[PDB]
Swiss-Prot record:
Domain observations: The TPR repeat-binding motif mediates interaction with TPR repeat-containing proteins like the co-chaperone STUB1.
Subcellular localization: Nucleus; Cytoplasm; Melanosome; Cell membrane
Residues annotated for ATP binding in this entry: 57, 99, 118, 144
PTM annotation: ISGylated.
Designated name of the protein: Heat shock protein HSP 90-alpha
Oligomeric and partner information: Homodimer. Identified in NR3C1/GCR steroid receptor-chaperone complexes formed at least by NR3C1, HSP90AA1 and a variety of proteins containing TPR repeats such as FKBP4, FKBP5, PPID, PPP5C or STIP1. Forms a complex containing HSP90AA1, TSC1 and TSC2; TSC1 is required to recruit TCS2 to the complex. The closed form interacts (via the middle domain and TPR repeat-binding motif) with co-chaperone TSC1 (via C-terminus). Interacts with TOM34. Interacts with TERT; the interaction, together with PTGES3, is required for correct assembly and stabilization of the TERT holoenzyme complex. (Microbial infection) Interacts with herpes simplex virus 1 protein US11; this interaction inhibits TBK1-induced interferon production.
Residue ranges, annotated region (Interaction with NR3C1): 15-233
Residue list for modification N6-acetyllysine: 64, 90
Native source organism of the sequence: Homo sapiens (Human)
Chain positions found as Phosphothreonine: 11, 13
Family membership noted in the UniProt record: Belongs to the heat shock protein 90 family.
Function recorded in the entry: Molecular chaperone that promotes the maturation, structural maintenance and proper regulation of specific target proteins involved for instance in cell cycle control and signal transduction. Undergoes a functional cycle that is linked to its ATPase activity which is essential for its chaperone activity. This cycle probably induces conformational changes in the client proteins, thereby causing their activation. Interacts dynamically with various co-chaperones that modulate its substrate recognition, ATPase cycle and chaperone function. (Microbial infection) Seems to interfere with N.meningitidis NadA-mediated invasion of human cells. Decreasing HSP90 levels increases adhesion and entry of E.coli expressing NadA into human Chang cells; increasing its levels leads to decreased adhesion and invasion.
């Protein structure tokens, strides 16, 4: 059956075997769940400090690269730049904070992002009740959850040298999931994807992002870059 030309659908290659991703669901530690509901459902002045908290966590993870090289010098051989990228996507209403820090293992995600108690949680909720500024959250050891000031859902994609790539996700409500992530390999580090609330889209705007970086995050110690999607004609 001679052919001289085939159509695209004919020479489309058969799919790669379907990947299985294992998913685990966990309850937040009880006081972390209470804090998340307080953060989500209360009006605060000064919500913009969420970005300072996430940049601080990236900066901590980057500092760990430098020090882990003292017990494991092979990290010196990585050609990856130590940096942070901020990536607003107006199409999808997401703000992503990307770093090339150490990343998290699966058990790091489960323990550090929601199942282990933090000793400051109860004191912080009392300080908030008593009218403290939400900015105080970092000093109480619970800064990550500031993401929920502006995001309705948070997805964390991460890769640590000692484990495979994982995705953590929570829309609050008391639980989170951790699953293996067989999609786009992101390389060592962490991506925090903020699915912004509808009234918090200012944090997609170039000027607003630059304003709050300059106000709150001037001593990162690593390059930070803002990716701005070109406005279409
Ligand atoms: N970008 C990132 N890279 C690596 N680990 C991160 C991270 N963001 C958060 N984490 C992990 O999440 C933990 C909780 O962060 P918090 O900001 O809530 C409290 P703290 O440990 O920074 O004082 C961090 O200790 C770290 O283990
Ligand atoms: Mg922190
Ligand atoms: Mg520092």
């Amino acid at each position: 059956v001679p052919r001289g030309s085939h159509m695209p659908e004919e020479t489309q290659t058969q799919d790669q075997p379907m990947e299985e991703e294992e998913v685990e669901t966990f309850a937040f530690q009880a006081e972390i769940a209470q804090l998340m509901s307080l953060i989500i459902n209360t009006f605060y002045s000064n919500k913009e400090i969420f970005l300072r908290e996430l940049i601080s966590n990236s900066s901590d993870a980057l500092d760990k690269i430098r020090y882990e090289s003292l017990t494991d010098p092979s990290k010196l051989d990585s050609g990856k730049e130590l940096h942070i990228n901020l990536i607003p996507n107006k199409q999808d209403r997401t703000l992503t904070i990307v770093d090339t820090g150490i990343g998290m293992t699966k058990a790091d995600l489960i323990n550090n992002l929601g199942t282990i108690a933090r000793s400051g949680t109860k004191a912080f909720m009392e300080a908030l009740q008593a009218g403290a500024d939400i900015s105080m959250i970092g000093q109480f050891g619970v800064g990550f959850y500031s993401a929920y000031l502006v995001a309705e859902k948070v997805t964390v994609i991460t890769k640590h040298n000692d484990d495979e790539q994982y995705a953590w996700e929570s829309s609050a409500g008391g639980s989170f999931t951790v699953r293996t992530d067989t999609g786009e390999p992101m390389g060592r580090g962490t991506k925090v994807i903020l699915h912004l609330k509808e009234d918090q889209t200012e944090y997609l705007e170039e000027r607003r992002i630059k304003e709050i970086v300059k106000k709150h995050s001037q001593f990162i110690g690593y390059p930070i870059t803002l990716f701005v999607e070109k406005e279409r004609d």
